[PDB]
Amino acid sequence: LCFGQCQYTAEEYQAIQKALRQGHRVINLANEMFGYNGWAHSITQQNVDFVDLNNGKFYVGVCAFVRVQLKDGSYHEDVGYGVSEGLKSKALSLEKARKEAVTDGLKRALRSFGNAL
């Protein structure tokens, strides 16, 4: 059926659970375990907490919520934070903080499914 409506078989579910019980690495692990079409992730919220200028340096902090969903319908959502310090230009700091926040949120949300992740 369509994504979010299919169901696993007994053997497939058992194998997946056994493997589970035991950021490119985590993405590769997820693709190998669930399959390229077996999982999805999205961003539900993001905002900038503060942007401060020190003596020629920028300090930035970003928050982001990441939602991970499976083919069956189960989901997990967690928060991620990104920080950049000691940089000279605003753009690089903001870019790094925003990307790191999303990556950390994805990692934390994907850890909830098992110890392997």
Q: How far is CA 91 from the centre of its chain?
A: 23
Min. distance of Cβ 25 from a second copy in angstroms?
Answer: 11
Our CB check for a second copy shows the closer of 55 and 114 to be 114
CA–CA dist 64, 102 (Å, integer): 6
Return the SS3 of 108. Answer: helix
* Token digits of residue 13: 């579910």
Partners of 81 in beta bridges: 63
Among 10, 12, 25, 40, binds a second copy (CB under 8 A): 40
φ and ψ of 73, to 5 deg: 140, -15
**Contact flags string 16-35 toward a second copy, x per CB under 8 A:** xx--xx-----xx--xx--x
> How many residues belong to the site for a second copy (CB under 8 A)?
63
x-marked contacts with a second copy along 53-92 as a string, rule CB under 8 A:
------xxx-x-x-x--xxxxxxxxxx-x-x-x---xxxx
CA distance 117 to 96: 23
The CA-based angle 16-100-71, given to 5 degrees, is 25
Q: Least distance in Å: CB of 56 to a second copy?
A: 15
> Tokens in use for 114?
């098992």
Please give the residue ranges that form the binding site for a second copy (CB under 8 A).
Answer: 1-5, 7-8, 13, 16-17, 20-21, 27-28, 31-32, 35-43, 46, 49-50, 52, 59-61, 63, 65, 67, 70-79, 81, 83, 85, 89-92, 94-95, 98-99, 102, 108, 111-115
